[PDB]
Design a binder for this molecule. Structure first.
Ligand SMILES: [Zn+2]
Ligand SMILES: [Zn+2]
Ligand SMILES: [Zn+2]
Length: 73
């Protein structure tokens, strides 16, 4: 698939963005990537997915800083 992580979200699924590093609030991380990245110590915001979205881990165009969790790099 296109995504390093490539978990895809159900409706109602909790996801995270980072207000410090995300290009915009639609740049989003799955809970497992989030909890394994530098952003867990930043100004993060939780978003409830409306369904159909996907994790942006390792999207190097989506993060000013810290684009990969430890698991995906
Ligand atoms: Zn992920
Ligand atoms: Zn990841
Ligand atoms: Zn951050």
């Amino acid at each position: 698939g296109s995504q390093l992580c490539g978990r895809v979200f159900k409706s109602g699924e909790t996801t995270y963005s980072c207000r410090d590093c995300a290009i915009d609030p639609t740049c989003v991380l799955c809970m497992d990537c989030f909890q394994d990245s530098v952003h867990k110590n930043h100004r993060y915001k939780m978003h409830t997915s409306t369904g159909g979205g996907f994790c942006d881990c390792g999207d190097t165009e989506a993060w000013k800083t810290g684009p990969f969790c430890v698991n995906h790099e």
